[PDB]
Symmetry: C2
Subunit: 583 residues, 2 copies
């Protein structure tokens, strides 16, 4: 029974509490080398009186693995258990140590989940699910205030636009075209850095306690927030808590004071002088940009600064959370203390961090709420855009990570597809609105929180940091309405139902060398089913469904598809952005 | 290449910092289905300039797994990497996601260790290694003070001794026969609960701020500590931070105040009345002993109490650390806050917790320092005592857990073999001093911290809670000196060298159906090699060694063994407590 394949580790995604009484148990094995697997758990005290095999079910299957669900509510908020791992009539149960052949006599050597402590519990702001993001770079979005700088005016490029120079994007602008996003139909907004910096990208933080003069001030921000919290839209601010722009005071001190500097440890010293030239930054910097030293996040005073900082805005601006510019490099400790803080200021505060890699570490309810689900992103794009991965692969990538994280966090994943740090979805494809649409959809079709990089609903071809961050197009003329409409529809659609929000998620087609996808989601009222066609063109499908429901109404066109045979016939024009529910 | 076997998870034991610059990388695979495996790491920025394959080496092999070492010092306190996983001429490197076939182009999809933050770092009190414990139950050890209680006098039993009634063991007593342990040759001492309780086992804590009146007071304790810290011996106190004896004030309130009680949440309410009778404890208790309610470790006030409590004694008694009666059931959070505290009071404080199961969770440098290495214990006993497991199995059990934990924690494992919670080593065997000796040895032969349950150096046959906790034998007559001598020797021996302390640890014999063991440890000065024979009797061995050294001097008898052939001949009387170094 391909024994050397199974795995089960306490915590992370392989054992965690969803609530303060129920618990989930995950277990992995070879693709289909596992007839069944029951969860044998109970209380570590009166064992022979609390044991109940919990039929673990297959929830996901990546390339070479089978994962298993299992809903357990320990009679006494505590559980010791093993696993069954069954095949044919062959049985072998897993213990904390080896693989027994006869039912474990003493619960002593069995896995164990100490006690359900409603505190340690992971409780990310559930309002994210209902919510639907929309990212925005303050620098080049809107400028409702003529007082900014001397450099470059609004838009100019088309294919090769936006240089790493300047533009006058302000907050007021956002306050202006706010009713515009209101038109777009947003739920929340993520703001890139907007703290007294000295560059277009405000990641060169001079003061963690002030809004760049050009941008505005607290009020402007607040006045901006207030209408948001009025239009029912949360708000997020960038937390450059790792590196500080060369400007940042404590740094200057060290520079213009070398050794004797009283802020010697506020960062990381390597060489007496603060020289670099061509050699190497004599101090731990971001990547290798001297104008960005890494803060000694472990340093006491440094802590408070950033701490009171984080809470500050939350406290006074009343923002809706912090995005962590780059967290996968800042003390996990500060991260700990961080939450507690941003919680005692606003429990519902959303702690999003920038982690492009597997981050089950920070998602232990001990540090973050969510992260940049690049892994997810790395799938869609790797499927719809680059179209190098097939269907199964997609479902496969939506397994290694589908299970990789716990039930909750997963449901609150900041699943985007593009940002200021990378290229734009559109160009990723290439004016293939069709190809794009099918992706953007999956985004607003999967669970967790989706994010819309400003300018796209309208249609914008970006590139990398300079390109991607292309100026906004405020001339109604340039307005891919059929694209904006696409969005709105997709948006409200993401709202119109809950299954798409956080419903189930099966699949009825992925067969290897294929490009046609179909999956299912549902609650106890409405059951919808989405289908997409990547084919360079048309392609018809065939697949079975259930009866409990009543019919199959074409969503968008509000048309109606019939079950027909014991299988529903579904046609795809070429890039079937076609999906529907089932009365 | 049996692909579905490999595993690598960030943190825990599969990725951690040993110091603030060097890092270890573990990787598992099938027993011998892995020619080699190199660690491909570097910096996630200037990749093509910092990459260096680190030859991961085989450090341990359980039943069906191969684990790999790898010493890495990221040029810039940060590392992104993958793995090589090689066999024959067949190569396939592991990434954060899939198993590539061609060298990974972009470090983007590679594993990553954020940044080496010397704070998050795991730094358990290194003085434990050099140190050698010795557990002691205050209740029935020594009574240098005639004022205790009305019940039972000193020892009485032999085979069926010590009932769950009473005896007058005091602290003063310890202060008396202290020079006795001084004779025994101890380094540290773990004290079971000794806080105002109402039972022989002080786990029925009435006040976390006082020493049971019978026992004594702070001074007595201090006066006891002072001579210890004078005889160069640390001290540990039991932390009943999960449940409180029925006596405990806040409880009484809830009992004699039902609902209206102001301490309603200080614990866990389930039923308005505090009844139980035969039904079930209307409140979350230890196991199912109403006279022990579980403290709402999450409760604010509750925190401080225990908090200031923990630090209190450390602060004033100046103890050397806390053992956690039962931690695998107390909020992991409190555990967090706990450390920070017991650290700002005494950094070198030792946070030992009672976790009988795999606890890599608490050993993340985020909560504990060490635990009750029952897994280890579960091996030795399962080998030397019960003698149901062979040699390899032993080495095998010393693999699933040898790697299970990080390099450091492992080196600081409270590796005992018996305590008040279980039976005694001796009886576990049965007057077979021989069989015992060989075990006790491995204990003082493996790495981490060993622990001597009081009374044993002299020879005491215990049982379970009532038995095991048999009164102490202070009549010089009953004195298995050849056994005590065994200890002393073994003790000083554990001191006489460092290899045994924390040296390497290979093996030169384990062959399946066998009971003869031999392993190696060493530093850059002395190389020793231990061998043991479980055979019901005699048994001679044959095995190779190295030349770098100079010879092979029989330790105990200070006799001398010769390399002879390219292999050394070694004779075992029946239970060869024989071990030696090699000039």
């Amino acid at each position: 029974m391909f024994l050397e394949a199974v795995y089960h580790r306490p915590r992370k995604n392989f054992s965690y509490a969803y609530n303060g009484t129920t618990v989930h148990l995950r277990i992995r094995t070879k693709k289909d080398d596992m007839t069944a697997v029951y969860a044998l758990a109970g209380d570590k005290y009166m064992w022979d009186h609390t044991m109940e095999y919990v039929p673990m079910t297959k929830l996901a299957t990546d390339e070479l693995f089978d994962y298993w669900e299992c809903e357990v509510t320990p009679p006494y908020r505590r559980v010791k258990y093993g696993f069954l791992l069954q095949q044919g009539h062959e049985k072998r149960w897993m213990t904390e140590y080896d693989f027994l052949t006869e039912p474990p006599a003493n619960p002593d050597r069995l896995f164990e989940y100490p006690f359900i402590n409603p505190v340690d519990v992971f409780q990310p702001p559930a309002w994210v699910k209902d919510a639907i993001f929309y990212q925005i770079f303050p620098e080049r979005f809107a400028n409702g205030d003529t007082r900014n700088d001397p450099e470059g005016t609004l838009p100019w490029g088309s294919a090769d636009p936006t240089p790493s120079c300047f533009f006058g994007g302000d907050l007021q602008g956002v306050i202006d075209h706010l009713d515009h996003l209101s038109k777009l139909g947003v739920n929340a907004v993520y703001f890139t850095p907007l703290f007294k910096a000295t560059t277009n990208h405000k990641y060169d933080t001079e003061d963690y306690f002030q809004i760049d003069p050009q941008f505005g001030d607290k009020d402007t921000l607040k006045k901006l927030v207030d209408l948001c919290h009025e239009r029912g839209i949360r708000v997020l601010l960038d937390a450059v808590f790792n590196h500080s722009g060369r400007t940042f005071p404590p740094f200057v001190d060290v520079l213009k004071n070398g050794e004797k500097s009283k802020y010697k440890d506020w960062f990381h010293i390597r060489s007496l002088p603060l020289e670099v030239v061509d050699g190497i930054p004599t101090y731990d910097t971001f990547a290798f940009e001297p104008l960005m030293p890494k803060l000694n996040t472990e340093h006491p005073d440094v802590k408070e600064y950033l701490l009171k900082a984080a809470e500050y805005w939350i406290r006074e601006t009343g923002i809706d959370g912090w995005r962590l510019d780059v967290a996968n490099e800042v003390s996990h400790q500060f991260w700990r203390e961080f939450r507690r803080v941003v919680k005692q200021a606003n429990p519902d505060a959303y702690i999003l961090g920038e982690v492009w890699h597997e981050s089950s570490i920070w998602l232990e309810g001990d540090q973050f709420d969510a992260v940049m689900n690049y892994p997810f992103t790395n799938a869609v794009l790797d499927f719809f855009i680059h179209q190098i991965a097939d269907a199964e692969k997609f479902s496969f990538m939506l397994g290694k990570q589908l299970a990789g994280y716990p039930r909750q966090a997963s449901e609150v994943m900041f699943n985007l597809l593009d940002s200021h740090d990378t290229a734009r979805l559109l160009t990723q494809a290439d004016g293939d609105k069709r190809k794009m649409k099918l992706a953007v959809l999956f985004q607003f079709t999967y669970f967790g929180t989706p994010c819309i990089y400003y300018g796209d609903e309208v249609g914008l071809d970006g590139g990398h940091d300079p390109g991607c961050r292309k100026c906004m197009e405020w001339d109604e003329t340039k307005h891919d309405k059929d694209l904006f409409a696409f969005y709105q529809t997709v948006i409200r659609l993401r709202q119109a139902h809950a299954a798409l929000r956080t419903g189930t998620f099966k699949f009825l087609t992925a067969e290897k060398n294929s490009r046609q996808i179909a999956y299912l989601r549902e609650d106890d009222q409405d059951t919808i089913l989405v289908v997409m066609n990547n084919d360079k063109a048309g392609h018809t499908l065939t697949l079975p469904v259930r009866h409990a429901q009543w019919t199959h109404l074409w969503q968008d066109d509000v048309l109606t598809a019939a079950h027909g045979q014991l299988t529903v016939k579904l046609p795809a024009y070429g890039f079937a952005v076609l999906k529907a529910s089932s009365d």
